[PDB]
């Protein structure tokens, strides 16, 4: 959208899955959602 | 709340824009010299590759593929030089906007930090121009000397060269930002090691931001960032 | 609600699409003539610059760097000519869709507006082709005549040329849209002055849309729009 | 996104601060939010 | 829920990434052979067109317009060959991830589908290279032979060429995906006809994604997709 | 945004109006909204 194609998003998600891994990805998922919710109510 | 900070920010943004405009005028008055400085490595590389080719056998030159290519290149180079020349005014206005906010404890660390970052960016740009470019351009042109004819166009060359210079300037500022943070003390080896898992995702996000939508460009820009992160780990470990 | 209007809109959008397709066929039958008209000013510039260059010394020509560049340019030029040829049908269908909506008070100010706007757009294209381009192209090529070799490619030229022609037509339609709004009476000199503070933001918002993501292209397009707004001030001020 | 880069965004905001100025920027900010809210409830 | 599936997905995504890297290393070792294979039709087209143009009169060649064009093209071609070489490993890993999920009833239809789909993709690439490209490239170059000089650059050629090869492979996989869904029995002639109204919108949505923001590129890509749907109509009608 | 221009969108919309037509366009609109609502509540 700002210089990133769909393949760029797929590669970023691939690195996320590979490196955050089984654990610590749900921890990041609920932290991003909390951060996303934090800016919503402010 | 934001009323005085917007009244003050406006009169500093105005000064910064005026400085950028004056720098643009000054750079355009000398656009030929800056363009010659920029294209000097390319001419040397083309001449050397031509000598190698005409020795193996026993042409290529700078072109422009757009009607407004030369004028737009001159304007772009002048704009970049003007921004660089207005950077001291931009940074001075930036400091005056945040100087009261910063405490006296860390106010004496900003001026040395600014001086060090500026000198390291200048060293990086000079290194990219005088050490990296003469070998890199020659090798890249010699890579396709036996198959293709190097009809290099100025429009894309200027962007490529400015990207190389800027990337090497910042790539020298990354190992000194970490050093400055480590001397004062805010992060250690463990912190920069166990945060690598998000750091790689951030690096790939930045690579996607700073590259065309191709994946290959993303990887080719993420690899130097990974190496810079490793060098930062080593620097923090030494301190 | 929208049920009767969508049925009517569909049968008028179908006619407009057919007009473009028929205009495309006619344009492609004469694509050599239209390309010759588009390409003629560049040949004049390259030949005229060549005589100056071959006088200081005492080559450049139109190329294509894509395999399908010649075919795509012929289609692109034919597509643009097809839309222009279909404009009477498109505008007639547009009027028939909104004719009952407009009151009889303002129905007789639409036909003069369409005729006046169209005749001013044609003058803008002719002025850009015959008055601006012969001097503009010669100056731009001369700028990089002593430094680079103008290997101009048709793919980027057609987009550059068509933008100049299309842009100048709209650039002549802005001083007549304001003039049309002035005689009837809807805005005054004050209104076009106290709304400048927003209008500058929209101009820069419009500049970003019609330019590549570079800031310089934004400024190089915002500057003409500022002057067009400036000329709009006197037009309303004189009326 | 539609031809607009990131550095493109900053210039437009840069014009916004300079010309709208200290006053009349909050007035536009609450008008944009009201317009944004207007299309939401419709 | 996703805890066991993410542990399995991670260890199979890692193997696929390793396969790409190993395929990239092998491809780069033979990048001259692959580039020669890729560029061979362009040389044949330029030489064959040259004999025509050197007959009406009674030059053009492959160039590079970027400094890093030769090296980046070698990496890009090697990257594409790496992914193609990693497809058996990627597909085997993909199958192992969904093999327990699929029931025994449809598990014996996936292997013929993968073999059948892959063999049709290979035919599409070979058909594009050996049957379509020799006539298409010669026609495209001859179209602009009496007006412009074909100074084709390798950077834009590789993107154009692999799109033709990849696209024709998928263009042959669409008429066999439809057949596979028809022999087992899931859609009929009527279903593929009364869903055309959404299909035409989806095709233009897909054509928009796979093309530059120009409308003509959208139309030039939507037309082959419509014909593929038309052929797919007849395939289900015969079965 | 992802390779899609503004003029790209209008063509897609033009096909939607032209082919779906008077009927079956409101049916598509309420199905897209339902699908958009479906992913929101999940």
């Amino acid at each position: 959208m700002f210089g990133m194609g769909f393949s760029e998003i797929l590669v970023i998600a691939l690195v996320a899955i590979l490196f955050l891994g089984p654990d610590k990805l749900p921890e990041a998922m609920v932290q991003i959602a909390k951060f996303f919710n934090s800016v919503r109510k402010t | 709340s934001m009323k005085p900070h917007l009244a003050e920010l406006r009169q500093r943004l105005a000064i910064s824009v005026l400085a950028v405009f004056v720098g643009f005028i000054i750079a355009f008055t000398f656009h030929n010299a800056i363009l010659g400085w920029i294209t000097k490595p390319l001419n040397n590389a083309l001449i050397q590759v031509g000598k190698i080719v005409e020795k193996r056998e026993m042409n290529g030159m700078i072109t422009t593929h757009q009607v407004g290519g030369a004028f737009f290149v001159a304007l772009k180079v002048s704009f970049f030089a003007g921004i660089l020349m207005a950077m001291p005014v931009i940074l001075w206005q930036l400091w005056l906007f945040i100087a009261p906010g910063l405490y006296d404890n860390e106010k004496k660390m900003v001026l040395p930090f600014v001086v060090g970052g500026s000198v390291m960016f200048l060293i990086g740009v000079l290194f990219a121009y005088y050490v990296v470019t003469p070998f890199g351009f020659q090798f890249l042109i010699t890579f396709g000397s036996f198959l293709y004819t190097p009809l290099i166009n100025i429009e894309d060359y200027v962007g490529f060269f400015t990207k190389i210079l800027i990337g090497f300037g910042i790539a020298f500022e990354l190992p000194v930002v970490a050093y400055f943070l480590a001397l004062l003390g805010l992060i250690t080896d463990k912190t920069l090691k166990d945060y690598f898992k998000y750091a790689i995702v951030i690096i790939f996000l930045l690579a996607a931001f700073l590259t065309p939508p191709d994946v290959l460009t993303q990887l080719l820009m993420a690899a130097p960032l990974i190496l810079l992160y490793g060098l930062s780990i080593l620097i923090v470990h030494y301190v």
Side-chain angles (χ1 to χ4, degrees), chain A residues 1-5 7-8 11-12 15-16 19-20 24 27-28, chain B residues 194 196-198 200-201 204-205 208-209 211-215 218:
Chain A
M1 44 91 100
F2 264 37
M4 333 181 38
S7 55
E8 308 280 49
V11 172
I12 283 169
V15 202
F19 274 96
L20 290 319
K24 209 209 168 211
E27 170 273 338
Chain B
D194 53 29
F196 178 59
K197 314 172 254 193
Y198 317 79
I200 192 55
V201 188
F204 272 85
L205 191 39
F209 273 149
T211 44
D214 311 335
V215 177
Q218 205 203 141

Side-chain angles (χ1 to χ4, degrees), chain B residues 182 185-194 232-233 236-237 239:
Chain B
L186 205 77
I187 51 191
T188 174
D189 35 1
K190 320 139 188 72
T191 296
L192 226 36
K193 240 154 44 167
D194 53 29
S232 170
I233 270 287
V236 152
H237 180 219
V239 81

Side-chain angles (χ1 to χ4, degrees), chain B residues 57-204:
Chain B
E57 181 71 18
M58 162 69 246
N59 316 340
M61 203 41 73
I62 306 203
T63 71
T64 173
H65 79 256
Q66 322 229 37
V67 192
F71 196 68
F72 182 65
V73 159
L75 288 174
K76 198 205 292 278
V77 163
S78 282
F79 197 53
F80 293 153
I83 299 193
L84 253 66
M85 270 191 301
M87 201 76 38
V89 179
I90 292 168
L91 285 192
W92 181 45
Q93 291 307 303
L94 212 160
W95 190 71
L96 257 298
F97 185 43
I98 61 186
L102 279 43
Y103 294 61
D104 198 12
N105 165 79
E106 52 272 13
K107 263 174 71 162
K108 35 176 148 310
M109 86 79 74
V110 158
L111 150 68
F113 151 73
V114 154
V115 152
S118 322
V119 86
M120 200 76 40
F121 189 90
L122 203 85
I123 272 169
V125 162
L126 293 204
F127 181 77
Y129 182 79
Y130 282 110
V131 171
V132 152
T133 291
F135 303 157
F137 277 9
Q138 172 183 324
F139 161 77
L140 288 173
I141 300 289
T142 326
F143 198 85
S145 82
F146 31 98
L147 327 184
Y148 324 121
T149 291
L151 290 196
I152 312 306
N153 78 292
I154 192 59
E155 299 95 29
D156 310 335
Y157 168 66
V158 167
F160 180 64
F161 185 69
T162 56
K163 276 170 188 3
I164 287 198
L165 288 194
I166 284 324
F168 261 89
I170 319 194
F172 270 67
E173 204 157 271
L174 267 275
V176 65
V177 152
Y179 182 88
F180 281 168
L181 268 48
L183 266 181
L184 85 84
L186 205 77
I187 51 191
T188 174
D189 35 1
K190 320 139 188 72
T191 296
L192 226 36
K193 240 154 44 167
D194 53 29
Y195 277 38
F196 178 59
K197 314 172 254 193
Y198 317 79
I200 192 55
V201 188
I202 305 276
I203 278 165
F204 272 85

Side-chain angles (χ1 to χ4, degrees), chain A residues 5-6 8 16 23-25 30:
Chain A
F6 196 41
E8 308 280 49
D23 40 0
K24 209 209 168 211
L25 191 35
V30 309

Side-chain angles (χ1 to χ4, degrees), chain A:
Chain A
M1 44 91 100
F2 264 37
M4 333 181 38
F6 196 41
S7 55
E8 308 280 49
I9 298 315
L10 303 179
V11 172
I12 283 169
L14 197 160
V15 202
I17 289 164
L18 258 175
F19 274 96
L20 290 319
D23 40 0
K24 209 209 168 211
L25 191 35
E27 170 273 338
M29 196 247 285
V30 309
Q31 277 304 296
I32 286 299
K34 185 248 285 182
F35 257 52
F36 145 79
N37 211 7
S38 316
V39 280
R40 205 256 302 168
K41 47 91 171 173
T42 40

